[PDB]
Amino acid sequence: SDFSPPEGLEELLSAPPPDLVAQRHHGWNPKDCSENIDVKEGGLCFERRPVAQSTDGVRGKRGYSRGLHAWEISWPLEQRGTHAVVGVATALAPLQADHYAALLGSNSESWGWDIGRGKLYHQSKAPQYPAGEQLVVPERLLVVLDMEEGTLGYSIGGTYLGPAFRGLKGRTLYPSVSAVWGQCQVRIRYMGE
Numbered sequence: 001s002d003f004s005p006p007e008g009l010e011e012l013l014s015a016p017p018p019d020l021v022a023q024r025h026h027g028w029n030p031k032d033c034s035e036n037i038d039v040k041e042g043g044l045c046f047e048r049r050p051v052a053q054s055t056d057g058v059r060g061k062r063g064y065s066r067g068l069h070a071w072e073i074s075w076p077l078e079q080r081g082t083h084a085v086v087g088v089a090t091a092l093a094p095l096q097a098d099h100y101a102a103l104l105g106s107n108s109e110s111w112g113w114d115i116g117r118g119k120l121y122h123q124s125k126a127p128q129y130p131a132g133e134q135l136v137v138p139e140r141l142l143v144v145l146d147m148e149e150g151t152l153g154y155s156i157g158g159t160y161l162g163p164a165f166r167g168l169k170g171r172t173l174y175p176s177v178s179a180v181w182g183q184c185q186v187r188i189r190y191m192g193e
Contacts, residue, residue: 001155003162006068006146012192013070013142026062026071026190032174033058034096036182044189050182055083055103057095060175060188069145070155071175072189075115076139081181085112085121087164088145088152089176104178111152111165112178115141120164129154130161142191145173 018026027043034056039046048056060071073086085104093109105112105121112121118135119126128135142155150169154161175188 001159005160029061055097057178063172065172070191074140074187079184083180085178087112088173
């Protein structure tokens with residue numbers, strides 16, 4: 001877009017999108033998530049309840065170790081809070097904390113984009129991304145995981161912002177998100193492989 005997206009991304013996004021079963025198959029996992037989040041719509045949406053002093057996350061049902069993978073995340077602006085972090089995670093990242101934090105990316109088992117202030121989190125306990133314009137993240141963002149190249153990048157308003165993270169080769173990564181505000185509805189639409 002203003003960055004060159006991984007090869008074959010335009011093709012997979014143009015193609016007829018995966019059907020309802022495939023998207024659910026790749027959705028939020030009701031059995032891999034904080035006790036404070038409820039997964040709805042067969043995996044396509046998750047809600048964090050209004051629990052105070054807790055940070056909570058969730059992993060997708062499917063973990064990726066090869067190929068190109070994109071999913072669309074839709075996260076209403078007014079349900080973001082102070083720590084809306086969107087990214088990916090090994091099977092080993094913790095999915096809740098008992099204080100307020102940017103949980104996704106605060107360890108070495110996860111990579112997060114802070115879609116509010118535009119910081120990159122990995123082993124954070126942060127560089128800006130994109131590299132005097134205010135970051136504005138629309139309701140809907142594209143998460144692009146390239147496991148052949150080992151990069152995680154994002155796409156907003158028809159613009160690939162380029163790789164946020166490298167060094168992903170050899171891992172098995174799940175879509176993941178970490179949130180602190182409650183009464184949110186955050187949707188995942190897997191776009192394909």
